[PDB]
Design an enzyme around this catalytic site. Structure first.
Site, PDB file in Angstrom:
ATOM      1  N   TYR A 163      63.859  48.426 -27.324  1.00  0.00           N
ATOM      2  CA  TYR A 163      65.533  48.215 -27.368  1.00  0.00           C
ATOM      3  C   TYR A 163      65.865  47.712 -28.747  1.00  0.00           C
ATOM      4  CZ  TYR A 163      70.353  46.935 -26.213  1.00  0.00           C
ATOM      5  OH  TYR A 163      71.731  46.876 -26.354  1.00  0.00           O
ATOM      6  N   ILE A 198      77.664  41.732 -20.870  1.00  0.00           N
ATOM      7  CA  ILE A 198      78.670  42.371 -20.127  1.00  0.00           C
ATOM      8  C   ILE A 198      78.470  42.771 -18.693  1.00  0.00           C
ATOM      9  CG2 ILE A 198      80.492  44.101 -20.738  1.00  0.00           C
ATOM     10  CD1 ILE A 198      80.044  42.235 -23.042  1.00  0.00           C
ATOM     11  N   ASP A 199      79.313  42.725 -17.905  1.00  0.00           N
ATOM     12  CA  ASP A 199      79.263  42.786 -16.357  1.00  0.00           C
ATOM     13  C   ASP A 199      79.005  44.201 -15.797  1.00  0.00           C
ATOM     14  OD1 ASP A 199      82.536  42.310 -14.950  1.00  0.00           O
ATOM     15  OD2 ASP A 199      81.762  43.771 -16.246  1.00  0.00           O
TER      16      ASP A 199
HETATM   17  N1  LIG Z   1      76.098  45.567 -20.872  1.00  0.00           N
HETATM   18  C1  LIG Z   1      75.489  44.549 -21.611  1.00  0.00           C
HETATM   19  O1  LIG Z   1      75.361  43.378 -21.097  1.00  0.00           O
HETATM   20  C2  LIG Z   1      75.321  44.710 -22.985  1.00  0.00           C
HETATM   21  C3  LIG Z   1      75.403  46.229 -23.441  1.00  0.00           C
HETATM   22  N2  LIG Z   1      75.259  46.802 -24.454  1.00  0.00           N
HETATM   23  C4  LIG Z   1      75.484  48.053 -25.345  1.00  0.00           C
HETATM   24  O2  LIG Z   1      76.654  48.564 -24.767  1.00  0.00           O
HETATM   25  C5  LIG Z   1      76.331  50.134 -24.510  1.00  0.00           C
HETATM   26  C6  LIG Z   1      76.462  50.508 -23.112  1.00  0.00           C
HETATM   27  O3  LIG Z   1      75.820  49.583 -22.007  1.00  0.00           O
HETATM   28  P1  LIG Z   1      75.953  49.478 -20.578  1.00  0.00           P
HETATM   29  O4  LIG Z   1      77.613  50.101 -20.339  1.00  0.00           O
HETATM   30  O5  LIG Z   1      75.846  48.208 -19.924  1.00  0.00           O
HETATM   31  O6  LIG Z   1      75.077  50.817 -20.058  1.00  0.00           O
HETATM   32  P2  LIG Z   1      74.818  51.672 -18.829  1.00  0.00           P
HETATM   33  O7  LIG Z   1      73.586  51.671 -18.246  1.00  0.00           O
HETATM   34  O8  LIG Z   1      76.118  51.323 -17.991  1.00  0.00           O
HETATM   35  O9  LIG Z   1      75.286  52.840 -19.505  1.00  0.00           O
HETATM   36  C7  LIG Z   1      74.560  53.698 -20.227  1.00  0.00           C
HETATM   37  C8  LIG Z   1      75.215  55.124 -20.356  1.00  0.00           C
HETATM   38  O10 LIG Z   1      74.265  56.098 -21.413  1.00  0.00           O
HETATM   39  C9  LIG Z   1      73.851  57.168 -20.372  1.00  0.00           C
HETATM   40  N3  LIG Z   1      72.499  57.451 -20.675  1.00  0.00           N
HETATM   41  C10 LIG Z   1      71.252  57.167 -19.969  1.00  0.00           C
HETATM   42  N4  LIG Z   1      70.210  57.788 -20.526  1.00  0.00           N
HETATM   43  C11 LIG Z   1      70.777  58.531 -21.105  1.00  0.00           C
HETATM   44  C12 LIG Z   1      70.124  59.885 -21.942  1.00  0.00           C
HETATM   45  N5  LIG Z   1      68.865  60.045 -21.935  1.00  0.00           N
HETATM   46  N6  LIG Z   1      70.752  60.630 -22.783  1.00  0.00           N
HETATM   47  C13 LIG Z   1      72.521  60.507 -22.602  1.00  0.00           C
HETATM   48  N7  LIG Z   1      73.038  59.415 -22.020  1.00  0.00           N
HETATM   49  C14 LIG Z   1      72.156  58.471 -21.208  1.00  0.00           C
HETATM   50  C15 LIG Z   1      74.189  56.834 -19.135  1.00  0.00           C
HETATM   51  O11 LIG Z   1      74.488  57.785 -18.116  1.00  0.00           O
HETATM   52  P3  LIG Z   1      73.478  58.719 -17.467  1.00  0.00           P
HETATM   53  O12 LIG Z   1      72.780  57.951 -16.681  1.00  0.00           O
HETATM   54  O13 LIG Z   1      74.351  59.647 -16.501  1.00  0.00           O
HETATM   55  O14 LIG Z   1      72.834  59.530 -18.418  1.00  0.00           O
HETATM   56  C16 LIG Z   1      75.015  55.841 -19.099  1.00  0.00           C
HETATM   57  O15 LIG Z   1      76.486  56.652 -18.925  1.00  0.00           O
HETATM   58  C17 LIG Z   1      74.820  50.161 -24.760  1.00  0.00           C
HETATM   59  O16 LIG Z   1      74.687  51.045 -25.958  1.00  0.00           O
HETATM   60  C18 LIG Z   1      74.267  49.056 -24.973  1.00  0.00           C
HETATM   61  O17 LIG Z   1      73.138  48.961 -25.933  1.00  0.00           O
HETATM   62  C19 LIG Z   1      74.598  45.593 -25.522  1.00  0.00           C
HETATM   63  C20 LIG Z   1      74.373  44.255 -24.983  1.00  0.00           C
HETATM   64  C21 LIG Z   1      74.775  43.956 -23.899  1.00  0.00           C
HETATM   65  C1  LIG Z   2      71.895  37.865 -21.376  1.00  0.00           C
HETATM   66  C2  LIG Z   2      71.193  37.931 -22.523  1.00  0.00           C
HETATM   67  C3  LIG Z   2      71.408  36.972 -23.825  1.00  0.00           C
HETATM   68  C4  LIG Z   2      72.675  37.024 -24.300  1.00  0.00           C
HETATM   69  C5  LIG Z   2      72.895  35.939 -25.255  1.00  0.00           C
HETATM   70  O1  LIG Z   2      72.034  35.353 -26.020  1.00  0.00           O
HETATM   71  N1  LIG Z   2      74.383  35.264 -25.182  1.00  0.00           N
HETATM   72  C6  LIG Z   2      74.719  34.380 -26.116  1.00  0.00           C
HETATM   73  C7  LIG Z   2      74.046  33.117 -25.868  1.00  0.00           C
HETATM   74  C8  LIG Z   2      74.666  32.315 -24.667  1.00  0.00           C
HETATM   75  N2  LIG Z   2      74.237  30.755 -24.624  1.00  0.00           N
HETATM   76  C9  LIG Z   2      72.767  30.598 -24.418  1.00  0.00           C
HETATM   77  C10 LIG Z   2      74.521  30.236 -25.984  1.00  0.00           C
HETATM   78  C11 LIG Z   2      75.164  29.767 -23.916  1.00  0.00           C
HETATM   79  C12 LIG Z   2      75.286  30.363 -22.375  1.00  0.00           C
HETATM   80  C13 LIG Z   2      76.369  29.949 -21.951  1.00  0.00           C
HETATM   81  S1  LIG Z   2      76.516  30.507 -20.028  1.00  0.00           S
HETATM   82  O2  LIG Z   2      77.756  29.735 -19.615  1.00  0.00           O
HETATM   83  O3  LIG Z   2      76.644  31.988 -20.191  1.00  0.00           O
HETATM   84  O4  LIG Z   2      75.223  30.056 -19.695  1.00  0.00           O
HETATM   85  C14 LIG Z   2      70.889  39.648 -23.369  1.00  0.00           C
HETATM   86  C15 LIG Z   2      70.245  39.621 -24.629  1.00  0.00           C
HETATM   87  C16 LIG Z   2      69.759  41.128 -24.522  1.00  0.00           C
HETATM   88  C17 LIG Z   2      70.459  41.831 -23.472  1.00  0.00           C
HETATM   89  C18 LIG Z   2      69.940  43.196 -22.803  1.00  0.00           C
HETATM   90  C19 LIG Z   2      69.907  44.277 -24.119  1.00  0.00           C
HETATM   91  O5  LIG Z   2      70.998  44.386 -24.770  1.00  0.00           O
HETATM   92  C20 LIG Z   2      69.224  45.421 -23.381  1.00  0.00           C
HETATM   93  C21 LIG Z   2      69.876  46.016 -22.148  1.00  0.00           C
HETATM   94  C22 LIG Z   2      71.337  46.773 -22.601  1.00  0.00           C
HETATM   95  C23 LIG Z   2      72.121  47.268 -21.222  1.00  0.00           C
HETATM   96  O6  LIG Z   2      73.415  47.787 -21.674  1.00  0.00           O
HETATM   97  C24 LIG Z   2      72.283  46.086 -20.305  1.00  0.00           C
HETATM   98  C25 LIG Z   2      70.979  45.283 -19.775  1.00  0.00           C
HETATM   99  C26 LIG Z   2      70.178  44.753 -21.229  1.00  0.00           C
HETATM  100  C27 LIG Z   2      68.674  44.406 -20.696  1.00  0.00           C
HETATM  101  C28 LIG Z   2      70.753  43.667 -21.682  1.00  0.00           C
HETATM  102  C29 LIG Z   2      71.387  42.588 -20.631  1.00  0.00           C
HETATM  103  C30 LIG Z   2      72.087  41.154 -21.451  1.00  0.00           C
HETATM  104  O7  LIG Z   2      73.108  41.417 -22.104  1.00  0.00           O
HETATM  105  C31 LIG Z   2      70.742  40.620 -22.421  1.00  0.00           C
HETATM  106  C32 LIG Z   2      69.240  40.395 -21.210  1.00  0.00           C
END
Ligand SMILES: NC(=O)C1=CN([C@@H]2O[C@H](COP(=O)(O)OP(=O)(O)OC[C@H]3O[C@@H](n4cnc5c(N)ncnc54)[C@H](OP(=O)(O)O)[C@@H]3O)[C@@H](O)[C@H]2O)C=CC1
Ligand SMILES: C[C@H](CCC(=O)NCCC[N+](C)(C)CCCS(=O)(=O)[O-])[C@H]1CC[C@H]2[C@@H]3[C@H](O)C[C@@H]4C[C@H](O)CC[C@]4(C)[C@H]3C[C@H](O)[C@]12C
Ligand SMILES: NC(=O)C1=CN([C@@H]2O[C@H](COP(=O)(O)OP(=O)(O)OC[C@H]3O[C@@H](n4cnc5c(N)ncnc54)[C@H](OP(=O)(O)O)[C@@H]3O)[C@@H](O)[C@H]2O)C=CC1
Ligand SMILES: NC(=O)C1=CN([C@@H]2O[C@H](COP(=O)(O)OP(=O)(O)OC[C@H]3O[C@@H](n4cnc5c(N)ncnc54)[C@H](OP(=O)(O)O)[C@@H]3O)[C@@H](O)[C@H]2O)C=CC1
Ligand SMILES: NC(=O)C1=CN([C@@H]2O[C@H](COP(=O)(O)OP(=O)(O)OC[C@H]3O[C@@H](n4cnc5c(N)ncnc54)[C@H](OP(=O)(O)O)[C@@H]3O)[C@@H](O)[C@H]2O)C=CC1
Ligand SMILES: C[C@H](CCC(=O)NCCC[N+](C)(C)CCCS(=O)(=O)[O-])[C@H]1CC[C@H]2[C@@H]3[C@H](O)C[C@@H]4C[C@H](O)CC[C@]4(C)[C@H]3C[C@H](O)[C@]12C
Ligand SMILES: C[C@H](CCC(=O)NCCC[N+](C)(C)CCCS(=O)(=O)[O-])[C@H]1CC[C@H]2[C@@H]3[C@H](O)C[C@@H]4C[C@H](O)CC[C@]4(C)[C@H]3C[C@H](O)[C@]12C
Ligand SMILES: C[C@H](CCC(=O)NCCC[N+](C)(C)CCCS(=O)(=O)[O-])[C@H]1CC[C@H]2[C@@H]3[C@H](O)C[C@@H]4C[C@H](O)CC[C@]4(C)[C@H]3C[C@H](O)[C@]12C
Ligand SMILES: C[C@H](CCC(=O)NCCC[N+](C)(C)CCCS(=O)(=O)[O-])[C@H]1CC[C@H]2[C@@H]3[C@H](O)C[C@@H]4C[C@H](O)CC[C@]4(C)[C@H]3C[C@H](O)[C@]12C
Ligand SMILES: C[C@H](CCC(=O)NCCC[N+](C)(C)CCCS(=O)(=O)[O-])[C@H]1CC[C@H]2[C@@H]3[C@H](O)C[C@@H]4C[C@H](O)CC[C@]4(C)[C@H]3C[C@H](O)[C@]12C
Lengths: 262, 261, 263, 262
Positions: A163, A198-199
């Protein structure tokens, strides 16, 4: 050059916007925000049935128009055709929000070349294909590309190797073409969003039970992404901690790029 | 965790080292330095004739052994089989130096998806395939992976978008598995090298009439890469200016990584 | 709290300003700028002869009024009395520009404790005394204190040890009282100016070799100081190089101070 | 140049060390550590009564020798004569630890020029006078000057204006002479110590009811100061938080100084 302006939701009124990965999570929330702002929206993801529900809610919320096209972004032909179709549905394109990712969970890298390739294809290459397909329309409208990325797209984390590679690749590619558009005088903005936890249902399931951290609201996250794109900002940082965003900044990199350009 | 000592050429004596993209440029220079150090080397690139020359010169310089295997890293099957054959030839593997790239020049991204794809496959995907193939042997020897990257793999430049994508990907991938190996007690080091302008034939042709900067010598560059790998350093920075290396460092990133763990 | 506006020369029209060390160099240029802007100016330094020339030219340039009071800032009684006199003459005080220094040349520290003491007295302690004396009037006018400092007041250099001590002291003291004014709701701004090489006679006689050519113009320097003070900026950085201004910034310090501000 | 070695307590064995403000707090703790290391120590402060107790305990702990000389560092003649006396008592001088301060409490600055001058005289000027007196002996021994300073000597705090001015002054002066010693090839090291909240009686009393933060142990504080001095470090940072010590570093200043040196 970013707009020296306060964001207003009216900036998106009547704007023609694609949102990918919009069946759930942040993408869905972005569709909803855009709908409330009275944008034309075309949403995509694989899930035909949930996409129709998203569209129906978008219309309820006051979207100028809302359509979905279902497909997998593993298919580069679908990606190409999708943009052409979305463009026709809306009569142009003002903003391309690239948000989808392939299924990713927290696991050690163990010989999984399949996952590396798939992550590169879906998370990176399809974004490039979509952009190429969208660029003529975006040039017409002086539009915007919004690329949704991650902390794992700026720093290294264990358990997300494939990723991370794909998200780093987005940074390298899109930041480079941004520099090209500046020198080529192409009036299309590129916004890279760096997101913390993000939740979304996906994130909450994934981090349970490995990471126990504060998750930021997906609705607010979605809004901030749109805001950054609307204001044509180079990067958007969104995290539950303001001190995280301070650590994401890389002025040293900015200086090196400045010294090269001049 | 790097070795808390100064580099000695004897660190590579009898070591079993793969160098990819070793027919010319930095790769060739690395092969030569390793040969001077009395390492066992297997070199690879596409051209068997130019590789033959490198192997011949390696044996002249005092390589413990030198062999070439020719092929394209566009072919993932070749990548996999190359490592096995290289390992067979040497009876193991201590260091995997990943250096090859697909031909790249300075040009605007003009909807060139084919170049983006080829860059990702050759510059990035093949490195992963080679690593997977090499890991069992490297785990046996507590060995090292050396990944050659670029300023364009740390910061953005116009005219190298596809290349930059691939090099950024290497950082993301290899820095992530480094963190994994640290927590999984895998004693294989990963070294990422960030290079400025190096006076290889390829570079000097590419920048001609476009970029007017002073180029660092390929010989010293090659040595610094080997040094960093031998010393198990996380990152190696090589540029003609010391101020460049200061600006590529990212302590903020390291802090974020430390806070995570 | 800085003023969220562009500088206008009219901001100084009719304002009542003291400039110390104003017989030559940046001080004189500041007096001349204020004169051009139609301010009321009182200038000071030890030499009546040079001050007379500054006053004469200030009037010519269009100062609302211009006067000098001569004396040494080694004398804390003079410092105190000077402010009272200047303030009474102008009928108030809007800006106190503290700029004077004791004579300093580049030399190795050579057990000259007397010079360390004099530097601390003239360059630092007198600024405090002038501030205490001026504060009642500045509070009345919601006025400004401008403290002229130096690169050697933010970083260390050989050959200026005593001077550096005194300029560092200014930073510590005035930056502290700024924090105090913020919490005590004192509406008097404090501007610390950090100056690189400026082409004053003193500096040009002091420095050696090609560095001379990197000297910033005293005229522009003086204006930038006035601008910062008028706009109620916390710090003014002025150097011929933009990279220097980048390196004097200390965000880490700013963060520690912010974290303390609510503790 | 700092010593390319790990600290050993034996580094202080038989060394001749002055510690000022050593009747209590960090100074007293420093004397105790030096005693344990078998150093010769001369301690000073105004109170002979408390100094006597420190000397008694130092001899107990195994100091090679321990003496006190009482006096006020408001008196520059005392400062100068003290160093000569102390050097005569030990037969030389290897380390000068400058640690004393005039009584300081948290209060708004209100026309107290008397206090500003006193702070400058005791906290700063006396340090210079003591250094001048000690330098010939320190040059003979390739010795060390240790200057104890403060977070308020690197950043601004309300309620300690006079004190801050004096500690900032120490930095400006001693950092300047350090540069002079480098170009003059004077083999005497200068160590500036930047201290956060330390649990001395003075600090605990001063912060009562106004500041609520973690206090670092005075014994460990004292040891780190000695260690940094012995290793000829330019700066010692000691605080309860390692993140504080990161925020007190000023690489930009170091670069500016390096560029001037070139
Ligand atoms: N949530 C987080 O904590 C974080 C999120 N992000 C980023 O934000 C973005 C959205 O994340 P988030 O909302 O959590 O992810 P979700 O899993 O909620 O959403 C991902 C979406 O992409 C689609 N998808 C999955 N596979 C495919 C495919 N093969 N082709 C087209 N669409 C697909 C899904 O729909 P369907 O299954 O219907 O295809 C789904 O709508 C991601 O780019 C991610 O990297 C980054 C860091 C942290
Ligand atoms: C939660 C962790 C770490 C984030 C981070 O490093 N955050 C700042 C540091 C915070 N500190 C440690 C400094 C303090 C915390 C204070 S606290 O009060 O929070 O404990 C981050 C880093 C990489 C992230 C994943 C990837 O994107 C891939 C994937 C995308 C999907 O869409 C959603 C799922 C998934 C597995 C993601 C979930 C989450 O997003 C991860 C695990
Ligand atoms: N020189 C510079 O200024 C810079 C160099 N770098 C980095 O250092 C590395 C080496 O650079 P440099 O020495 O200049 O490059 P060169 O062009 O000199 O050498 C590249 C090598 O890889 C091989 N190669 C090309 N295509 C393929 C393929 N499909 N399969 C297997 N091997 C191929 C070449 O051999 P053949 O053609 O025979 O196959 C060639 O030996 C690169 O990784 C690069 O990213 C980074 C920044 C700057
Ligand atoms: N020029 C530069 O490169 C730099 C200047 N600065 C700062 O800017 C300020 C002005 O510098 P610059 O213009 O070069 O200085 P000048 O030497 O030109 O002017 C100094 C003034 O202060 C006065 N002065 C000297 N001794 C005393 C005293 N005992 N009592 C009262 N006044 C005295 C002088 O008049 P008289 O002798 O008649 O009393 C003279 O008017 C200084 O605060 C300095 O720290 C900082 C960095 C660099
Ligand atoms: N504790 C903390 O939180 C911090 C401490 N520091 C620094 O560490 C140093 C030691 O602090 P701490 O141990 O708390 O201080 P203490 O108050 O415990 O000790 C100060 C010593 O200096 C002496 N002293 C006071 N006035 C004079 C004088 N006129 N002449 C000679 N000696 C005088 C005292 O003895 P007597 O009264 O008998 O003369 C006393 O021995 C100080 O330099 C301080 O700036 C910096 C930041 C924080
Ligand atoms: C930009 C302007 C202020 C800068 C930050 C500050 O400098 C404080 C801090 C110092 C550390 O040393 C390195 C990290 C950190 C967080 C900087 C990182 C980055 O450069 C910032 C965010
Ligand atoms: C602001 C914007 C760019 C920043 C500087 C650069 O980042 C380069 C460098 C990185 C080191 O880490 C710390 C030092 C230094 C000089 C930064 C310090 C500071 O933060 C600057 C001046
Ligand atoms: C030369 C430029 C810019 C490097 C840079 O930004 N360097 C620091 C600048 C230093 N300052 C500006 C601060 C001062 C200059 C002092 S000076 O005295 O030099 O003027 C760099 C950035 C990206 C680099 C290309 C890519 O890798 C892809 C490819 C790999 C091959 O293998 C070799 C060929 C090629 C085309 C590479 C050539 C060259 O390597 C490029 C153009
Ligand atoms: C000129 C030097 C150093 C300034 C500096 O460190 N400047 C930036 C660094 C520049 N680099 C080395 C990076 C090269 C860039 C070249 S570039 O072309 O980019 O500019 C500075 C540092 C301390 C300064 C003195 C003190 O204040 C005391 C006194 C005040 C009087 O009033 C005027 C006289 C005097 C003697 C002052 C003169 C001068 O002012 C000094 C020597
Ligand atoms: C305690 C404060 C603030 C220090 C600070 O800013 N410390 C780290 C940052 C705090 N953070 C909010 C970032 C983290 C806290 C997390 S925590 O979990 O700890 O709450 C510091 C700053 C200035 C210090 C005084 C001066 O020296 C003068 C004098 C010297 C004597 O000898 C001892 C008495 C006295 C009054 C000193 C006591 C104390 O030493 C002061 C008040």
């Amino acid at each position: 050059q970013p707009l020296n302006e306060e964001f207003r939701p009216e900036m998106l009124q009547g704007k023609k916007v694609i949102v990918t990965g919009a069946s759930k999570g942040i993408g869905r929330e972005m569709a909803y925000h855009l709908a409330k702002m009275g944008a034309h929206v075309v949403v995509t993801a694989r899930s035909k049935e949930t996409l129709q529900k998203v569209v129906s809610h978008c219309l309820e919320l006051g979207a100028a128009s809302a359509h979905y096209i279902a497909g997998t972004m593993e298919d580069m032909t679908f990606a190409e055709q999708f943009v052409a179709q979305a463009g026709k549905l809306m009569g142009g394109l003002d903003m391309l929000i690239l948000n989808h990712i392939t299924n990713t969970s927290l696991n050690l890298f163990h010989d999984d070349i399949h996952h590396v390739r798939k992550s590169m294809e879906v998370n990176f290459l399809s974004y490039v294909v979509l952009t190429v397909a969208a660029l003529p329309m975006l040039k017409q409208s002086n539009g915007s590309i919004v690329v949704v990325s991650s902390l794992a797209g700026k720093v290294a984390y264990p358990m997300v190797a494939a990723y991370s590679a794909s998200k780093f690749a987005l940074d390298g590619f899109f930041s480079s073409i941004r520099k090209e558009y500046s020198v080529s005088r192409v009036n299309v903005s590129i916004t890279l969003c760096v997101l913390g936890l993000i939740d979304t249902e996906t994130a909450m399931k994934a981090v349970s039970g490995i990471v126990h951290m504060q998750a930021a609201p997906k609705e607010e996250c979605a809004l901030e992404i749109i805001k950054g794109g609307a204001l044509r900002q180079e990067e958007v940082y969104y995290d539950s901690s303001l001190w995280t965003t301070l650590l994401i900044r890389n002025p040293s990199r900015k200086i090196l790029e400045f010294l090269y350009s001049t």
